[PDB]
Amino acid sequence: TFPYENELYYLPKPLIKIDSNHKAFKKLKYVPVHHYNQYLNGELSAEDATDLNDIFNIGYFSLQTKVSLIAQETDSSADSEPYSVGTFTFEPEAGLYFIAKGSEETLDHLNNIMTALQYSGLGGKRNAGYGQFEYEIINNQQLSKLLNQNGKHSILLSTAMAKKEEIESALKEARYILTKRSGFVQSTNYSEMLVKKSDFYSFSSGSVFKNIFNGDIFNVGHNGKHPVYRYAKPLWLEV
Amino acid sequence: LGVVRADIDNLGATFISGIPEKYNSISRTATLSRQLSLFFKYELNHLLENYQITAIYSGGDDLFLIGAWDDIIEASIYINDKFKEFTLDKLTLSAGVGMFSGKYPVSKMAFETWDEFKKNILEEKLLVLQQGFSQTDEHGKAFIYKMLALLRNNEAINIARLAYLLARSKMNEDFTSKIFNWAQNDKDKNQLITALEYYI
Amino acid sequence: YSKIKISGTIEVVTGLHIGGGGSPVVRDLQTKLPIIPGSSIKGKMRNLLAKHFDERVLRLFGSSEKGNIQRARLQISDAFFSEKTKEHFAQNDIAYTETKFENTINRLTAVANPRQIERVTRGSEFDFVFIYNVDEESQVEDDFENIEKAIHLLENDYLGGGGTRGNGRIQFKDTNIETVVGEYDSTNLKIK
Amino acid sequence: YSKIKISGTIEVVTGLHIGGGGDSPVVRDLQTKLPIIPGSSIKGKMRNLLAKHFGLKMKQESHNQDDERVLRLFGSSEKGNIQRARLQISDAFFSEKTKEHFAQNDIAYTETKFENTINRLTAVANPRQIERVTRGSEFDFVFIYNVDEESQVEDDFENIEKAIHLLENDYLGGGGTRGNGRIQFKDTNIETVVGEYDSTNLKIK
Amino acid sequence: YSKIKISGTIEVVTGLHIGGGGDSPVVRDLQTKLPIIPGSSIKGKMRNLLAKHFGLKMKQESHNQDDERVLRLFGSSEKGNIQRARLQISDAFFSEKTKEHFAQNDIAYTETKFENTINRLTAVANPRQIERVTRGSEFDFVFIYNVDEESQVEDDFENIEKAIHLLENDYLGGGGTRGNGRIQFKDTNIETVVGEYDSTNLKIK
Amino acid sequence: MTFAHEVVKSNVKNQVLFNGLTTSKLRNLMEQVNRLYTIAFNSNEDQLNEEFIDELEYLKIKFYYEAGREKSVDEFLKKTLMFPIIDRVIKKESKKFFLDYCKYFEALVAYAKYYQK
Amino acid sequence: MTFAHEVVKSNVKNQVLFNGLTTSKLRNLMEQVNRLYTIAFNSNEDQLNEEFIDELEYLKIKFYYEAGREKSVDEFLKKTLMFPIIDRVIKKESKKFFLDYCKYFEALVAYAKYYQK
RNA sequence: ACGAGAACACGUAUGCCGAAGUAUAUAAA
Numbered sequence A: 001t002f003p004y005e006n007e008l009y010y011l012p013k014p015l016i017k018i019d020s021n022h023k024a025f026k027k028l029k030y031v032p033v034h035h036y037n038q039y040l041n042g043e044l045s046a047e048d049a050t051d052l053n054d055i056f057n058i059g060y061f062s063l064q065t066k067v068s069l070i071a072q073e074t075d076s077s078a079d080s081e082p083y084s085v086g087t088f089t090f091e092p093e094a095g096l097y098f099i100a101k102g103s104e105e106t107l108d109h110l111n112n113i114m115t116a117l118q119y120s121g122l123g124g125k126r127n128a129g130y131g132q133f134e135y136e137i138i139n140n141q142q143l144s145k146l147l148n149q150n151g152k153h154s155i156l157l158s159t160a161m162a163k164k165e166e167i168e169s170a171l172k173e174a175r176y177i178l179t180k181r182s183g184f185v186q187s188t189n190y191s192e193m194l195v196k197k198s199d200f201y202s203f204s205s206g207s208v209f210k211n212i213f214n215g216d217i218f219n220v221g222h223n224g225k226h227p228v229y230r231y232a233k234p235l236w237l238e239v
Numbered sequence B: 001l002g003v004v005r006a007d008i009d010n011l012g013a014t015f016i017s018g019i020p021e022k023y024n025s026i027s028r029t030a031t032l033s034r035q036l037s038l039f040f041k042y043e044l045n046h047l048l049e050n051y052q053i054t055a056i057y058s059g060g061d062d063l064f065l066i067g068a069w070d071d072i073i074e075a076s077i078y079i080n081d082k083f084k085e086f087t088l089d090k091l092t093l094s095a096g097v098g099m100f101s102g103k104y105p106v107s108k109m110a111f112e113t114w115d116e117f118k119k120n121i122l123e124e125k126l127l128v129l130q131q132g133f134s135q136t137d138e139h140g141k142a143f144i145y146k147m148l149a150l151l152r153n154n155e156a157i158n159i160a161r162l163a164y165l166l167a168r169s170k171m172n173e174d175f176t177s178k179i180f181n182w183a184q185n186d187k188d189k190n191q192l193i194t195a196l197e198y199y200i
Numbered sequence C: 001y002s003k004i005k006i007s008g009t010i011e012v013v014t015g016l017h018i019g020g021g022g023s024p025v026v027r028d029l030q031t032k033l034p035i036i037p038g039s040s041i042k043g044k045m046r047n048l049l050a051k052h053f054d055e056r057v058l059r060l061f062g063s064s065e066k067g068n069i070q071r072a073r074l075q076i077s078d079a080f081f082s083e084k085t086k087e088h089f090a091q092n093d094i095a096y097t098e099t100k101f102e103n104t105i106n107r108l109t110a111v112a113n114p115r116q117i118e119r120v121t122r123g124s125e126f127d128f129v130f131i132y133n134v135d136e137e138s139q140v141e142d143d144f145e146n147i148e149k150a151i152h153l154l155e156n157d158y159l160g161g162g163g164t165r166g167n168g169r170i171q172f173k174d175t176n177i178e179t180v181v182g183e184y185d186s187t188n189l190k191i192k
Numbered sequence D, E: 001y002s003k004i005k006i007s008g009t010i011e012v013v014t015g016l017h018i019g020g021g022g023d024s025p026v027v028r029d030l031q032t033k034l035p036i037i038p039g040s041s042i043k044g045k046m047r048n049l050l051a052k053h054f055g056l057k058m059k060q061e062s063h064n065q066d067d068e069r070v071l072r073l074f075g076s077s078e079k080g081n082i083q084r085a086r087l088q089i090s091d092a093f094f095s096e097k098t099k100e101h102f103a104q105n106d107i108a109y110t111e112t113k114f115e116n117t118i119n120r121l122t123a124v125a126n127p128r129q130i131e132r133v134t135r136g137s138e139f140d141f142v143f144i145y146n147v148d149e150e151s152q153v154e155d156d157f158e159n160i161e162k163a164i165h166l167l168e169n170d171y172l173g174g175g176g177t178r179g180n181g182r183i184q185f186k187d188t189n190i191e192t193v194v195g196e197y198d199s200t201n202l203k204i205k
Numbered sequence F, G: 001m002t003f004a005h006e007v008v009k010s011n012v013k014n015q016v017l018f019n020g021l022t023t024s025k026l027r028n029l030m031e032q033v034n035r036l037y038t039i040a041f042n043s044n045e046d047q048l049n050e051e052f053i054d055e056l057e058y059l060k061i062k063f064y065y066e067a068g069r070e071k072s073v074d075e076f077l078k079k080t081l082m083f084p085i086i087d088r089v090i091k092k093e094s095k096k097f098f099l100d101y102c103k104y105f106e107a108l109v110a111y112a113k114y115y116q117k
Numbered sequence H: 001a002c003g004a005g006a007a008c009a010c011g012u013a014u015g016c017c018g019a020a021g022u023a024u025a026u027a028a029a
Helices: A036-040 A046-054 A104-117 A141-147 B012-016 B026-047 B069-086 B106-112 B115-135 B141-152 B156-168 B173-183 B186-199 C038-051 C055-061 C083-091 C137-155 D039-053 D058-062 D068-074 D096-105 D150-168 E039-053 E058-062 E068-074 E096-105 E150-168 F023-042 F050-069 F071-079 F082-092 F095-114 G003-010 G023-042 G050-069 G071-079 G082-092 G095-114
Strands: A002-004 A010-012 A030-032 A060-066 A083-089 A095-097 A154-156 A178-181 A200-203 B002-008 B053-059 B062-067 B093-099 C002-012 C074-076 C097-105 C112-120 C125-134 C170-181 D003-012 D087-094 D110-115 D128-133 D138-146 D183-194 E003-012 E087-089 E092-094 E110-118 E125-133 E138-146 E183-194
Touching: A002 A010, A030 A036, B002 B069, B012 B026, B026 B053, B026 B069, B053 B069, B062 B069, B069 B093, B069 B115, B115 B173, B115 B186, B141 B156, B141 B186, B141 C097, B141 C112, B156 B173, B156 F095, B173 B186, C038 C055, C038 C074, C038 C137, C055 C137, C097 D039, C125 C137, C137 C170, D039 D068, D039 D087, D039 D150, D068 D150, D110 F023, D138 D150, D150 D183, D150 E183, E039 E068, E039 E087, E039 E150, E068 E150, E096 E138, E096 G023, E138 E150, E150 E183, F023 F050, F023 F071, F023 F095, F050 F071, F050 F082, F050 G095, F071 F082, F082 F095, G003 G095, G023 G050, G023 G071, G023 G095, G050 G071, G050 G082, G071 G082, G082 G095
Parallel strands: none
Antiparallel strands: A002 A095, A010 A030, A060 A083, A178 A200, B002 B062, B002 B093, B053 B062, C002 C125, C002 C170, C074 C125, C097 C112, D003 D138, D003 D183, D087 D138, D110 D128, E003 E138, E003 E183, E087 E138, E092 E138, E110 E125
16 A cells, blocks of 8 residues: 555655665655656755655544443443554545556456445454545556556565565565564454464565566465465566 | 653764864764763763653663653753753754653554743743732633633634633733733744643 | 445534543544544444343444454444534534533532533534444344344433433434445335 | 433523523523533432432541432442442423523523622622523423333332422522522423333322 | 421512612513512521621621521531531512502502702702612512421521511611611411421421 | 724723723623524524514614713714614624624623723 | 604704703603503513503503693604504504504604703 | 454532622702
């Protein structure tokens, strides 16, 4: 997922080796589509970095407090157990956007499933009132142009992990960050607390590579009644 | 609770650029490094004595102190001034203090987190306001909060209403007059909002 | 597999107080308009519908913490001021929140210590959306009977704090039920 | 699990001053600009007087301890054994019948009676003015009672009968000893709004 | 606590002029536009007289801190003491018998009385117009007594009957010195409206 | 016409206000204004009742009477354009304009009450 | 309506008012009208009792007496159509119309008082 | 086959308490 504002679309920072501050670029995470090729070719200046950071108000964070009175407060004198949730709210013209590719039939199926999903959630406490959405499919000329270039490097836009037999030649010259991705599973065995996916590491969403690798949908499964899938397949941006 | 984070603004350059063209040996950058280190590893210990604060993670250019609300503000001002003394007003600090409720997971409060604030807000407006409420009782959180209710909605009809409210109060003419004159001006009224919020 | 949508608006008959800030009331940190959380609706509805009697409580809201796992079948979202309430209050120049002054009386002493509690204004309207994931065809009648009885109970109860002291009474108007996924008919299901 | 609704009207005998705003105005709804009786007022006065009915020793007064069954009716849930409240007192709102009445006959909704104070050794008077709700006003109230225990309905309604009757001989609001704020209840009603309980044997005068 | 009611009637002997609302009008209701005697007036007048009957030093007068037993009877709760009032006075309302009587004898409710001042060594008059409640009209009152303790009820009603006698030979209202404000008391009735106390041996003249 | 609302500060002479105006002398006017403000506020439509038109006529009557009784009230009413605005509000008969007059009058009253002997 | 308004400005001549009308000259009429006001207000129904009709008859008699006593009062009553209005009020026997007359006459008096020597 | 899934910022308490719209003010001519 990658955020947007009113009419500006955003992609992550390529972890590319720029030779000059080493400060203003560090505080920056995302670079809009207008100036992306400029960033890749050094046409971005420190004052421009400050300005782009200044314009990047695309949502704010919050902690909402809650209490849980299912406990013995039903029964007898017993303290409430306040808990906290973390939320994000977008301004009336923000959101997130996807990029998907495949056969036309696959994209028709994806449309059907997305229509199903818009009334379910896409987050955490879905059932408690968080995270519904309405979606629109728009074709932006500039993002298409950016996606359909041809170059020598590659910018990994998703989270991937090469299969066993390609990693040695995949990591020849690269700049990357790994992230322990964990979490529980939904309806696998009796106890949710006793079921927890094995930890998985994958490259982040900004890494740069020389040699492309295809990914695979890796099982993180064990001690279960059905396989549980994790996703690792790259969407490459070639410039 | 109070939490404070501070970074030296001109530290990348100071470490790197340093003193140009004539004092750039290993020796002189080394002594500068030692001076900053010893400042953040002794002087904080001494400066924090009169304050109800425990020191969490301090050194390099990171200042992470947590304690009582009022105390964090007072200690932050004291530390900023004492630093400007030791750096001879060459290096500046940027700092943020927020109010966080007790028993929050501290992992979450951390990810949330000068002359103007000292002279204009704390010293003048806060002092006259504290004296005003100290002299005249019955001005509980209700009266102050009605003042807020009028102020935050920046409208002229609200200015008339605030005039009525101050007229119905029993403060001295000087206090009411100063409050109303401040209320007429945008910068002053924001500062007044901040000061009275600090009063509570 | 179809998804039923239960949408409508709720009126604040007597002042409302959710007060996550406390004693402020929950708001949105930018719009500065009050909201009524989904957690509040769901919690009070669950407590009422359970105290009414269990397996049905597990079925509608889902517990999945008792050695067996059931997925929630009713999703409740937050509510917000409608455009209608906003425009009406703007034209007639009515603030969005009332503040009630309160007081307490000590015994053997009769000194009064006052309070300050904020309350959402009478007549305000909130727009809500519920979702019903029909995972079993042969139970939709029963489950909407249960949700009917729950809404009927909430009509005669309070939301938020201090309801015994006289606030939180709400009303439900303009409920429509539409099928938004799948090919299940919903022209017979009913909610007041 | 059933809930019983209690409905009626409150008729103001002599002027009433709740007046939580503090000149000295009365509480008013911000949608109609009309006086209201907060439900906390009803609950508190019933609490206090029906408490003072039964045992209320100095130790009970200091620790805010009360009688077991008044506590049952109104809930404590502070310490010891938590008893969730059982009678929900709502607010009262200015009725439409009396609104039509006073609009038609052109009668103000509020009087501002002026009062004086004759201090001693000086006999110098210092005036004051107080707003008070006009008599003949009618407020519409609703109570809800929850049946957490079936066998206790009779005793609880007996006690709330005590509460209504005792309140009719007392005041709401301020200046109660100065004449203000005596109320009467009229056209009561009992009806089962949720459940499978009969409410025919019930009465409230 | 039981509550003992006192009901009766004020007979207007000579004119009565409250005039809190002010050519110089009197206090009037707004639902009937017929005059009333505010309860604050009655309560203040009785408190002043009954205080004066007991001891009253310049210090008692200095801060309205009065003799302990009158304080008990009317409540202070100021000097760190727990004293809510034990005697409630309501307002008095133009009675129905009076309205019918004046209708069927064609007599107005209010007299407009013209007064002058004669300046010294000047002999020039400056006129005044004062409006007063007509004589012989009757208003009805109701009082409420609370029995916070059993063993002061007889003594407290002895005090109240003394006070009523003092009022029967004093003026209530404005300028009794200049002529108006004598009243009398008729038809005293004593009932215990809520409680289990007897109201047979207790009397007020 | 807001210069008519801040004329009140231009009328602090030497010290008496409006030549000795006190809000205490405005009480009957304030009471009537509050009465009909409540009555109008409860009303649904913009078109006022004809009886409400007669009520506004009664407002002008009371304004003239008060201006007759006291000279300071007379100056206050005359120079702040009270009479023309009352006539104009009677002319448009719309609720929102009546509320506009109510806000102007209440602002006048409160701001004047700010300064009193 | 408020024909009183423009009539009172039509009767300002050269200065005399209604050929010298003064507020002291209408005291008795004001008193009688006020008493009938309060009595009728006490009444519940709209139908006027025959006793109140007799009160209206005596009120008409009193207008005629005062108009015979002084010439300026006669001109005031004549031009302000007091006599035709009272005749119509007696014909109608409705309480609301009597209260409307009360309001009209009060406006007349208020204007006459505000314009004085 | 979503770092998930169970989870009412709930319970107790009111605008209270003492305060007189008073003091002079020949209904002259």
